[PDB]
Design a binder for this molecule. Structure first.
Ligand SMILES: Nc1ncnc2c1ncn2[C@@H]1O[C@H](COP(=O)(O)OP(=O)(O)OP(=O)(O)O)[C@@H](O)[C@H]1O
Ligand SMILES: Nc1ncnc2c1ncn2[C@@H]1O[C@H](COP(=O)(O)OP(=O)(O)O)[C@@H](O)[C@H]1O
Ligand SMILES: [Mg+2]
Ligand SMILES: [Mg+2]
Lengths: 534, 107
């Protein structure tokens, strides 16, 4: 026998993955546990590989090494994908050839009695005549993946190998590498849920518990419910950062204060270090990024009147609809209005008030000088990342700039438009939700390009349209010392005021650059000059 | 016997439920080869990639004694946009040529 029928995978390594082990062992490797006599009598061949895909750094290689060890196999021969590639002619294939040598010789001298060799790959998608389909010129020869296939299953047969491959993008894997007789069993390693984030944390902090270095203050259930969508590597980094910060705190404190030796030896880390590191040190990749909001909502949100509440309530209703309904797992919306009316800030607030696990903002500020194909790739990557969580919220910052629209011509890029139009109507995998919020300042152009037929709703962000609203906004913004405000109220009673909030901030700040005498007249003149009406 | 190739086009207003009816008609035929070629899985491809993909999906249907292929959202395959107009000539030509090519004898 090679293992007891029920196997075992816990406390020695792998954390939150326990169903995965049973599934893989019941599906594929059932031919190496049955009694050998019946296996020989039946006359069946064993599987010759498996494939594992999923997020990056979620615990794939550990499972590979464990499965290799538990079969009573020789030491694994790891190798990395992009490393076997050379500019010389006919040298990217000698590298592939130079990995099956020992197995070949051992099968040569000893036939049908050898052991097993595991040849774990990594980033197996680098060598594939399929990445060239996507826009660009990268043919990767297409001879490399004809020298690997011809060795696994060719005119000469090997019966003492087991190839395990891992990849991050399952959609660029060549089709000729998944037929029966070759890599022929797929499997997914998803993100860890609550129980996994508990087990991994328990595993990674046993040593410090053994010597009682950890204080009794810290719990683990609290830290297993705050970390949402963390991957295991992130948890390990969190523990390490907590250790380091506690160490630095203790050294600094005991150095500054000549404490007695009792606490000097004691190196308790407490819980404050944990929360400090969690909130200041580690930044997840598949979770909320609480830092960039401060770069968009720069001056809070002021309630100058009625419309703000209406907009926020509509956003709440759409969020609620997408959260708790079936038969409709994809929802869209579009915010539009006159320029400088504050459309981005409201979108950011609506997204933030949802409390979703995964929030992302795709704006053109980070695509300066990009060619259009790069923009398409970036958008596709963001959406792909968003597809890997139970709930999500993706914002598109400015749709008129993504297309490079210019009134002369008109001119724009077709590729981005078509990619967006296709992506707005693609449902996620079964059982997962999504929500998309747009933004723009030219509704008519999008209406003309047949783009307003893909969105599902629309919201209007009105502008300051009366003197009373301007007066209330100024009062809440707290300027002009309430005495010049009486003259301002007298002057702005006309009610023919059409100005944006951001422009209002700019005008107030500009007018505040003179002495108390001419400030009011300067501000009134500036407002009157820019007083264009619909 | 004197007509080994047929075609049909479903048309109507938007949001009318055309793809569902096409799929339901296809699934109710009991043909041994049944494929679908939609633009939902070609995001970011250039024109030549689309041509090669369509040609590949069509080539297989000539290796089976029966088949039924479906082409979905012809408008999005050609990259149409009312401004201009603009579109991909090469894909249109490939489609116009593939719509009138009978399979090898018998099929
Ligand atoms: N009620 C409010 N609504 C929106 N923005 C507000 C409000 N109160 C204050 N602000 C401030 O107004 C600014 C919002 O301007 P924002 O960048 O959203 O303009 P915009 O109309 O999207 O710009 P552009 O059209 O040039 O892209 C931020 O400073 C925000 O703090
Ligand atoms: N389920 C898990 N339990 C404990 N540690 C894990 C788990 N998954 C990943 N890790 C940690 O992640 C690291 C290995 O990452 P790995 O899975 O090799 O990334 P990749 O999939 O990119 O190869 C190890 O240091 C290990 O401690
Ligand atoms: Mg804007
Ligand atoms: Mg359709």
């Amino acid at each position: 026998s090679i293992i007891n029928p029920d196997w075992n995978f816990e406390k020695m390594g792998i954390g939150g993955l326990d169903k995965e082990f049973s599934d893989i062992f019941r599906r594929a490797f059932a031919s190496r546990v049955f009694p050998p006599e019946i296996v020989e009598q039946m006359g069946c061949k064993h599987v010759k590989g498996i494939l594992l895909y999923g997020p990056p750094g979620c615990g794939k290689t550990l499972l590979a090494r464990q499965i290799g060890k538990m079969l009573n196999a020789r030491e694994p021969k790891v190798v990395n994908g992009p490393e076997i590639l050379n500019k010389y002619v006919g040298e990217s294939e000698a590298n592939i050839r130079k990995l099956f040598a020992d197995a070949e010789e051992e099968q040569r001298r000893l036939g049908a009695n050898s052991g097993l060799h595991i040849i774990i790959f990594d980033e197996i998608d680098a060598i594939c005549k399929q990445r060239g389909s996507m826009a660009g010129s990268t043919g990767v020869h297409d001879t490399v993946v004809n020298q690997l296939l011809s060795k696994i299953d060719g005119v000469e047969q090997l019966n003492n190998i087991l190839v395990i491959g891992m990849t991050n993008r399952p959609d660029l894997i060549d089709e000729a590498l998944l037929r029966p007789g070759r890599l022929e069993v797929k499997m997914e390693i998803g993100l860890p849920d609550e129980k996994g984030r508990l087990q991994i944390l328990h595993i990674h902090t046993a040593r410090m518990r053994g010597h009682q270095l950890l204080s009794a203050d810290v719990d683990i259930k609290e830290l297993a419910v705050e970390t949402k969508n963390f991957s295991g590597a992130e948890l390990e980094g969190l523990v390490r950062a907590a250790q380091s910060t506690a160490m630095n705190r203790h050294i600094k404190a005991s150095t500054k204060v000549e404490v007695d030796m009792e606490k000097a030896e004691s190196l308790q880390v407490t819980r404050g270090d944990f929360l400090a590191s969690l909130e200041n040190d580690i930044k997840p990749a598949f979770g909320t990024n609480q830092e960039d909001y401060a770069s968009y909502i720069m001056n809070g949100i002021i309630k100058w009147g009625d419309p703000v509440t209406r907009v926020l309530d509509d956003g709440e209703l759409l969020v609620q609809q997408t959260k708790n309904s079936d038969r409709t797992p994809l929802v869209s919306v579009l915010l539009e209005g006159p320029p400088h009316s504050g459309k981005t800030a409201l979108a950011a607030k609506i997204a933030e008030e949802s409390n979703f696990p995964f929030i992302k903002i795709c704006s053109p500020d980070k695509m300066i000088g990009f060619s259009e194909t790069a923009k398409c790739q970036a958008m596709k990557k963001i959406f792909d990342d968003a597809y890997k969580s139970q709930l999500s919220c993706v914002v598109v910052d400015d749709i008129e700039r993504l297309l490079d629209y210019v009134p002369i011509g008109p001119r724009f890029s077709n590729l981005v438009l078509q990619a967006l139009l296709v992506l707005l109507k693609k449902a996620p995998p079964q059982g997962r939700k999504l929500l998309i919020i747009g933004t723009t300042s030219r509704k008519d152009v999008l209406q003309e390009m047949e783009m307003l037929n893909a969105f599902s709703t629309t919201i209007h962000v009105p502008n300051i349209a009366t003197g009373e609203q301007l007066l209330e906004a100024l009062e809440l913004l707290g300027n002009f010392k309430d005495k010049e405000r009486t003259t301002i109220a007298q002057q702005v009673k006309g009610k023919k005021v059409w100005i944006g909030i951001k422009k209002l901030l700019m005008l107030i700040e500009m007018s505040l650059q003179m002495d108390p005498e001419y400030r009011v007249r300067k501000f009134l003149a500036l407002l009157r000059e820019e007083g264009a009406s619909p």
